[PDB]
């Protein structure tokens, strides 16, 4: 099973020889609640095709997150194009205390106990890239022990 959810959609335009034509972009995140998430960004002349193109973009480009138990291994930082996010693990029963694209990425990826904030520009494309980036760089004790000690 893969959770789906749209983040945002807007109505980019382009000035043509005569008037000005229109498109739509949609940003979607896909995951399974077991530490895999991916985002997608499709453009189309109409919203539903933009959303679908986004969803197939998102079902490829799935990463692996090394979750702990529904929360994060350790506090993690992410940046992308002037968008800095901070996630840290929480206690059980603490929800997804997260913002916009933060909440959606953390949800579909299978996190339940996070404590997140986004600092720079909160443009969803960039905050979702920042969040995915932070999550994919997270270390669990297994690989850190593997890479250095026991």
């Amino acid at each position: 099973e893969l959770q789906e959810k749209l983040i945002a959609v807007n109505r980019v335009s382009k000035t043509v020889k005569g008037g000005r034509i229109f498109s739509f972009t949609a940003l979607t995140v896909v995951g399974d609640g077991n530490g895999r998430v991916g985002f997608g960004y499709g453009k189309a002349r109409e919203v539903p095709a933009a959303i679908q193109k986004a969803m197939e973009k998102a079902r490829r480009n799935m990463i692996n997150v090394a979750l702990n138990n529904g929360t994060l291994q350790h506090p993690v930082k992410g940046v992308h194009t002037g968008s800095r996010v901070f996630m840290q693990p929480a206690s059980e029963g603490t929800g997804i205390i997260a913002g916009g694209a933060m909440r959606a990425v953390l949800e579909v990826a299978g996190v339940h106990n996070v404590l997140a904030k986004a600092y720079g520009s909160t443009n969803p494309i960039n905050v979702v890239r920042a969040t995915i980036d932070g999550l994919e760089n997270m270390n669990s004790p297994e690989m850190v022990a593997a890479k250095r000690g026991k």
Binding site: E92, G93, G95, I96, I97, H112
Partner: protein
């Protein structure tokens, strides 16, 4: 202040059945469930992220009949206790004397249960308590006063109570009409579809 409006229209906005109109007639044959309760009932109810948190918080309140000030206080206390806040909150809601009288059968609806509690006709450990939000603890003894054991409504409420599922966490006697709060119900034996995490997200900002 309670809520004194039409009971079913409150359930139809929430969609699901709320047990606040209880008896023989088995609603959707009472009156027109599953249209939100107004001139645009047929209109599509698709609603936002904040709308679903709001809808379930509203539904929990409508079940127990708690207003927003007490419900907020319940959340504060549950979020202060140790353990997950959502089941803390449901347990606080289910330890309410209003509710316990309902769930022990005697008391047809939680508003009739509250009608009983308020009217000096319930004893907790052998003395009259008429606060609906009174917290029952493990091993109180909730019982109808003798002066009100001859009341016909409590006797009638009892029969339509074993058709309702009887909670495990409390044990009641119908002959000598009297019960016993055994333990704080767990989330699991609270037979419901409450999604308490959207509630805790609602007040968490």
């Amino acid at each position: 202040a309670r809520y004194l409006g039409p009971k079913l229209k409150l359930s139809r906005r929430e969609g699901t059945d709320l047990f606040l109109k209880s008896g023989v007639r088995a609603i959707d044959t009472k009156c027109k469930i599953e249209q939100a309760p107004g001139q645009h009932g047929a209109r599509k109810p698709r609603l936002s992220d904040y709308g679903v948190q709001l809808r379930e918080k509203q539904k929990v309140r409508r079940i127990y009949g708690v207003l927003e000030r007490q419900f907020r206080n319940y959340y504060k206390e549950a979020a202060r206790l140790k353990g997950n806040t959502g089941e803390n909150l449901l347990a606080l809601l289910e330890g309410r004397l209003d509710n316990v009288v309902y769930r022990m059968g005697f008391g047809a609806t939680r508003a009739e249960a509250r009608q009983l509690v308020s009217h000096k006709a319930i004893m907790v450990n052998g003395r009259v308590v008429n606060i609906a939000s009174y917290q029952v603890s493990p091993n109180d003894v909730v019982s109808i006063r003798e002066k009100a054991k001859k009341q016909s409504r409590v006797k009638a409420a009892l029969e339509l109570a074993e058709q309702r599922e009887k909670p495990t966490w409390l044990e009641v006697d119908a002959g000598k009409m009297e019960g016993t709060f055994k333990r704080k119900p767990e989330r699991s034996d609270l037979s419901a579809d409450i999604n308490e995490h959207l509630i805790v997200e609602l007040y968490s900002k």
